[PDB]
Amino acid sequence: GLLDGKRILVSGIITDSSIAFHIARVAQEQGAQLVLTGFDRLRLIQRITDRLPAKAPLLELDVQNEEHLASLAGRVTEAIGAGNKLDGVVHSIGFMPQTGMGINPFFDAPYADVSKGIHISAYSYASMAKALLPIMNPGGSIVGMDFDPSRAMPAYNWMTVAKSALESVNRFVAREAGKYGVRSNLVAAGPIRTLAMSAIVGGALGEEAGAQIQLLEEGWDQRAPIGWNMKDATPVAKTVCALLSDWLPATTGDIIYADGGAHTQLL
Template sequence: MTGLLAGKRLLITGVLTEASIAFHTAKHAQEQGADVVLTGFGRLSLVQRVANRLPRPAPVVELDVQDATHLDTLAARVRDHTDRLDGVLHAIGFAPPSCLGAPFLDSPREDVSVAIEVSAFSFKSLVVAVKPLLGPGAAIVGLNFDGQAAWPAYNWMGVAKAALECVNRYLARDLGRDGIRVNLVTAGPLRTVAASAIPGFTGLEEGWTARAPLGWNAADPGPVARTVCAVLSDWLPATTGSLIAADGGVLALAPV
């Protein structure tokens, strides 16, 4: 089989619906020659139905990144489907409602802790869990939204994304000696399940579309998914610890 990812074996987390970046990444990766294993949390029957809509049905492994048993056994359960991983997509994020849209100063410590653990610390947790399956040349990619600015309503999820960006740099530092690359793809706003939890998302989407030099279609995860596939490939062998934007060019512009 030929393609950008021919022969690659990938673990892709965060597939919930066909609108997700993770689903489109799995789809494009298969079209480029990769074999994929998916992870799901909670509604596994739904994830499996979505997995069956890929060009080639993919196996689904349960993963709750807050469950130590799930993490400790992940490598063994992935080995039921493949003996190695060449790439991993971390597409996991969550913040309780008090951390999105509600007054920033009112968010309780417990809810902020959940947002940081699931959206940032889990990047490290996932890497540690699958490291026995990774070898030189492997690539780890996380999904990001700009953590450098204070966006309306994004609140503590913005803090979590800033933490994720920092985790990315430290993972790149520590895994480089093993020949493993770690990068984030920073996406523009897309109409995913996660986006539906952000108050005022429509306004963010409209403003983004108006400003993007290349234009922006919030209904199309394809450009972001293809960027992820490129970073998972062998074509960026000297790139690690980076934030790679797939956002139509908005983040390159001066703020208004």
């Protein structure tokens, strides 16, 4: 297995459509022993994670809760066993209130909402690394999920800004992680039809917003030299596992694009 014997924490499962669910599934397929973290709907997440190939401890983690972060390393160690450390960490956490993303005008997002989104989507990458680097092994890997924010685009609005901030945070986390012999990287994924995305295409945010996302997806598959299937999360999960493995050992502070090559093509 690509990740045989590795202990990997995976955050961000809320449904079986979560990118984190597929990351977890592929990692287990490849021999990893997981610890999972979830937020808020733990009963729901327990039932979901029971559908993974293998058993894994589930720990509560609200990244805005300072006490959860302060206790996380101790709680992980209790879950994986004293004398064991993590080899991998997956951050698959993002949030921006609908005032900052969707149909609301860019200028009408109140800062308190933007600030909450940046806390969860960008700052928390640093706070999770702070909590977990003390219990990570040399050769380990931290991976976060990104959406290429180098150009502006309709609807994504302040979530784009949060991803820009995340990319910056990743480069600083790499500095810290390197002291432990750990890599930090992001995977910038193409669009994936989560339940939220399928609701928007179906008209949840109105006719315009539905047309804009359809146009995004059509164009994405068009530009990608190898195509892009927004219904298939597996290529993204595999890429995360590649970064968690020993096969990209000289890559850190970086961004790997799992997007069909769309970002390399203008039209």
